[PDB]
């Protein structure tokens, strides 16, 4: 996974209209039409496009793309950094949402989802689920056989691979 290789993969990850959209903002900081912008403006374009890198993350990227000291970042490297950030942010969002999902499922707030809680939420979806079906989910997800799903087990059940 070389730079060019990473760059190829960053473009395949986005739709072309998204890429053109990203470049239209990036171009407003170029001016010289060189295809690059100052590393001092990278945080601003990234936030303009919905990303939220921390200052340490910004520092780390700049050090990664500015080894020759030109003080600029080109568009292709920009896309790589944007896809890195997108993936990190989206994963943060999913984790957050799963913790919310669990507090809701765990009706009595004991820190566990029991079969009663599990059946109540699945039946409320409107799907025609049977008690068999609920009990099958419980057994497959209950890794330590204590009859309930803790948060770790929940994460594993939901993310599936996990």
- Which residues here bind Mn ion, judged by CB under 5 A? 106, 108, 110, 112, 142, 144, 146
CB of 95 to Mn ion, least distance (A): 20
**Ligand-binding site membership of 140 (annotated):** no
> Which residues does residue 38 pair with via DSSP β-bridges, in sequence order?
72
How far apart are the C-alpha atoms of 136 and 139, rounded to whole Å?
5
The answer to the question of whether 110 is labelled as a binding residue is yes
Q: Indicate the residue among 65 and 149 with the shorter CB distance to Mn ion.
A: 149
77 is in an annotated binding site: yes
41 annotated ligand-binding residue? yes
The DSSP code for 145 is -
From CA 122, how far away is CA 156, in angstroms rounded? 18
Minimum distance between the CB of residue 65 and Mn ion, rounded to whole angstroms? 46
Residue 70 Rama label (left phi>0; alpha psi -120 to 50; beta): alpha
Cβ–Cβ < 8 Å for 81, 46: yes
Q: Which positions make up the binding site?
A: 30, 32, 36, 41, 66, 68, 70, 72, 77, 106, 108, 110, 117, 142, 144, 146, 148, 153
């Amino acid at each position: 996974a070389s730079m060019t290789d990473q760059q190829a993969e960053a473009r395949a990850f986005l739709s072309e209209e998204m890429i053109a959209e990203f470049k239209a903002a990036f171009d407003m900081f170029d001016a010289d039409g060189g295809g690059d912008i100052s590393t001092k403006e990278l945080g601003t374009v990234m936030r303009m496009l919905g990303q939220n890198p921390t200052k340490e993350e910004l520092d780390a990227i700049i050090e990664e793309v500015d080894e020759d000291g030109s003080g600029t970042i080109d568009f292709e490297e920009f896309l790589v950094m944007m896809v890195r950030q997108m993936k990190e942010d989206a994963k943060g969002k999913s984790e957050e949402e799963l913790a919310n999902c669990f507090r809701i499922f765990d009706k009595n707030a004991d820190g566990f989802i029991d079969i009663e809680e599990l059946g109540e939420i699945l039946r409320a979806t409107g799907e025609h689920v049977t008690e068999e079906d609920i009990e099958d989910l419980m057994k497959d997800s209950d890794k330590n056989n204590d009859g309930r799903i803790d948060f770790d087990e929940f994460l594993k059940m939901m993310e599936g691979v996990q």
